[PDB]
A = this chain, B = another copy of it.
Amino acid sequence: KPRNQQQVCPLQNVPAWGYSLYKGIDMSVPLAYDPNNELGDLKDVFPSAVDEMAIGYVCGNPAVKHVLTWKTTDAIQKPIANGDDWGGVIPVGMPCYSKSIRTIKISETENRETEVIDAAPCEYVANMFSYWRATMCYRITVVKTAFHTGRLEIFFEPGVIPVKPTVNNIGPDQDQLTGAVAPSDNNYKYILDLTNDTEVTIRVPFVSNKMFLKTAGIYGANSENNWNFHESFSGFLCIRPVTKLMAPDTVSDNVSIVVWKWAEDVVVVEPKPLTSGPTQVYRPPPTASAAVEVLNVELQ
């Protein structure tokens, strides 16, 4: 009966406004019966008694990064060198540092190089964001017998990491990390004696004269591109024998050193990878000759 008394409201046709957010109200039409369709609690759905998606716990999942070999031959004040990948010099960053290059044949005039990174649970998550910040924890184990005697040293050194860039990779400069050129007298350290202890968990708080650190890691790191690598760790842990490894001929002249990795008090920043390419999981081809799928950043 009466006429309008309401004012003219301003508009804008912006469907899916801020659909990239985690909170808010979604406009998707539920193909159901009840407008308030909703499932109950996760109780009885999963066996886990702890939220299985909380960043803190995911990153808390331990994982082995190195399995070095300490020979009675190795000299003291020299980070265990050895292949595997790194070790004596652990990047101590949250992102991943180790990587292998899979080179396949395409013709007698070219090859296809694809980076394969063996990231741990924490390194796997740090790849979804741009910057990070947390306290890195590492549990160093020395698999051996009560007959082996030694004293391994583990010291931390903040700043750049002495490396020797490659045309397609980046490795440590062991030559620049000897007890002579790299005295660990003033560096925070710990000396694990094999006869008394067999393990030690070292927690390294966040320290990088920077609020956050990049998560680039070793991704696309080489001679020409190795800057993002440095700006993504803040330091490195060095494992140099203080006393040469002792071991009778009745046992083995070697001792495996297992090292686990995980983070605590973690805080990530931007919801987007810092890599130059979309997040992609490497899928081992049927044959060592089969080619892999490469994702681009082109849009139609």
Among B8, B24, B31, contact of A1 (Cβ-Cβ < 8 Å): B24
Nearest-CB residue, chain B, relative to A29: B18
Binds B, one of A32-40, A109-117, A151-159, A283-291: A32-40
Pick from A13, A17, A23, A271 the residue with the most CB of B within 10 Å.
A17
Q: Is A7 an interface residue (CB 8 A)?
A: yes
Contact mask A1-39 → B, CB, 8 Å, 1/0? 111111111111111111011111111111111111000
Closest CB-CB distance, A268 to chain B, in whole Å?
A: 10
Nearest-CB residue, chain B, relative to A129: B33
Nearest-CB residue, chain B, relative to A271: B33
Are the C-beta atoms of B3 and A26 separated by less than 8 Å?
yes
Interface size on A, residues (CB 8 A): 36
Residues of chain B with a CB closer than 8 A to A271's CB: 32-33
Are the C-beta atoms of B10 and A10 separated by less than 8 Å?
no
Closest CB-CB distance, A43 to chain B, in whole Å?
A: 15
Nearest-CB residue, chain B, relative to A269: B33
Are the C-beta atoms of A8 and B15 separated by less than 8 Å?
yes
Among B10, B14, B17, B22, contact of A17 (Cβ-Cβ < 8 Å): B10
Once A3-B27, A4-B27, A28-B3 are accepted as A-B contacts, the answer to whether A34 and B9 lie under 8 Å apart by CB is no
A6 to B14, CA, bound (A): 12
Pick from A3, A22, A28, A35 the residue with the most CB of B within 10 Å.
A3
Among B12, B20, B27, B28, contact of A15 (Cβ-Cβ < 8 Å): B12
Residues of chain B with a CB closer than 8 A to A23's CB: 1, 34-36
Once A6-B7, A7-B6, A34-B21 are accepted as A-B contacts, the answer to whether A14 and B27 lie under 8 Å apart by CB is yes
Pick from A1, A8, A11 the residue with the most CB of B within 10 Å.
A8
Residues of chain B with a CB closer than 8 A to A14's CB: 8, 10-12, 27, 29
A16 to B15, CA, bound (A): 16
Closest CB-CB distance, A7 to chain B, in whole Å?
A: 4
Residues of chain B with a CB closer than 8 A to A31's CB: 20
Task: Give the 5 A-B CB pairs with smallest separation, nearest first.
Answer: A12-B15, A8-B10, A7-B25, A10-B17, A33-B271
Given A3-B28, A24-B35, 14 additional A-B pairs, CB 8 A: A2-B26, A4-B25, A5-B25, A8-B11, A8-B16, A8-B17, A10-B12, A12-B15, A14-B27, A14-B29, A21-B30, A22-B33, A23-B35, A32-B271
Q: Give 17 pairs: A residue, B residue, CB < 8 Å, sorted on A.
A: A1-B22, A1-B23, A2-B26, A4-B17, A4-B28, A5-B25, A5-B36, A6-B9, A11-B11, A11-B13, A11-B14, A14-B29, A18-B29, A20-B31, A20-B32, A21-B32, A21-B34
